[PDB]
Amino acid sequence: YGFNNFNLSSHSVVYSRYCFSVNNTFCPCAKPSFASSCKSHKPPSASCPIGTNYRSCESTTVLDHTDWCRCSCLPDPITAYDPRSCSQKKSLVGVGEHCAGFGVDEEKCGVLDGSYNVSCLCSTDAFLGWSYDTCVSNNRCNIF
Numbered sequence: 001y002g003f004n005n006f007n008l009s010s011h012s013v014v015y016s017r018y019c020f021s022v023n024n025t026f027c028p029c030a031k032p033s034f035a036s037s038c039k040s041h042k043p044p045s046a047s048c049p050i051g052t053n054y055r056s057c058e059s060t061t062v063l064d065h066t067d068w069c070r071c072s073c074l075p076d077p078i079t080a081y082d083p084r085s086c087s088q089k090k091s092l093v094g095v096g097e098h099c100a101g102f103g104v105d106e107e108k109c110g111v112l113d114g115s116y117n118v119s120c121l122c123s124t125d126a127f128l129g130w131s132y133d134t135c136v137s138n139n140r141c142n143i144f
């Protein structure tokens with residue numbers, strides 16, 4: 001979903017704060033038709049991969065509007081108001097297992113009016129839940 005690599009100093013060591021496990025049918029991009037139907041707080045949309053469910057969103061009439069749209073994982077999956085609706089589930093890493101995945105901001109995946117002609121992807125800054133620090137002490141990198 002768009003994560004390519006990091007861009008940090010040579011001695012910069014990255015680490016995950018929170019890892020999110022998702023199903024094979026998860027997709028952070030909303031349906032282009034639903035976004036087109038939206039007129040207030042329109043979520044970004046993009047063509048999701050085949051066999052993956054689009055971003056969970058709902059339409060509710062709020063403040064005299066007729067197509068005001070609410071979505072899950074708001075504002076971000078890490079600090080979502082309700083993890084039940086969010087498709088990203090917090091899960092501790094098992095013994096001998098790597099990170100499940102960074103918390104991706106589904107509000108930055110794709111563009112505002114992405115149709116089915118553009119692939120589903122998210123920007124680099126959308127992936128949260130990571131931090132970094134240096135390893136240099138006495139001109140030596142600490143390693144475990």
